Amino acid sequence: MTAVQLIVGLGNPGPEYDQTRHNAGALFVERLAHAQGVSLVADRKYFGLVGKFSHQGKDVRLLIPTTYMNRSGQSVAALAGFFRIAPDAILVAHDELDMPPGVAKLKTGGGHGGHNGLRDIIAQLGNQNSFHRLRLGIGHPGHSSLVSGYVLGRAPRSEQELLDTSIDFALGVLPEMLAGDWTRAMQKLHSQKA
């Protein structure tokens, strides 16, 4: 029932991190900005790249933080604070170790499950975990001590292709996500195959 007003794509900024797995969220927002003809504006007020398009009478902002991943909440609280967007109207796209490339999934609430962008966003929003997440499969290196080197790696072509297919599946339920119809978005999405 709650229209989306902020879509956030997590990533690390800088050529050092560009095209790495940990930036799947920002790739999604970047694709979304492009399809919607939206320009992403370097806005130091929000410590990120900001854009907007109109949907159903409301402005939908797109945010790609330019702080480090671990300080993402600062970007998301700035923009969401200035505009008084509640967590319920926020969607955060992020890399998800727990699903393979090719798989995208939606979730409402829950933990950060170890993702330090999500953890910061949760802390900065006065401890509310209630925002929505678009989980973009990036696979798992199989061990916990490789995680950090893995998210920061660039995936081989086959996995990069499958990430791109799951971002295309996700854009397919954009009408549903923008409306806050999570049940349907989940239904159409979680029925695709890469």
Annotation says 22 is catalytic: yes
Strand pairing report for 48-55 and 58-65: antiparallel
Please give the residue range of the domain that contains residue 142: 1-194
Tokens of 125: 């929003």
CA gyration radius, the chain: 15
CA distance 138 to 159: 8
Binding residues for tRNA: 17, 68, 70, 116
The data reach a resolution, in angstroms, of: 2.2
- Among the options 22, 94, 115, 132, which is catalytic? 22
CA distance 35 to 169: 14
Into how many domains does the chain fold? 1
CA distance 174 to 160: 21
What is the CB-side half-sphere exposure of residue 11 using CA atoms within 13 A? 27
CA distance 75 to 87: 14
CB 21 within 8 A of CB 154: yes
Domain harbouring 124, CATH code? 3.40.50.1470
Tokens of 122: 């949760």
Q: Where are the beta strands (DSSP E) in the chain?
A: 6-9, 41-43, 48-55, 58-65, 90-96, 104-108, 132-137
CA distance 117 to 124: 11
Per the rule left: phi > 0, alpha: psi between -120 and 50, beta: everything else, 113 is left
Number of Cβ within 10 Å of residue 126's Cβ equals 8
Give the list of residues 6+ apart from residue 108 with CB closer than 8 angstroms, or none. Answer: 130, 131, 132, 133, 182
Binding residues: 17, 68, 70, 116
Handedness of CA 47, 92, 116, 27 (dihedral sign): negative
CB 10 within 8 A of CB 187: no
The structure's method of determination equals: X-ray
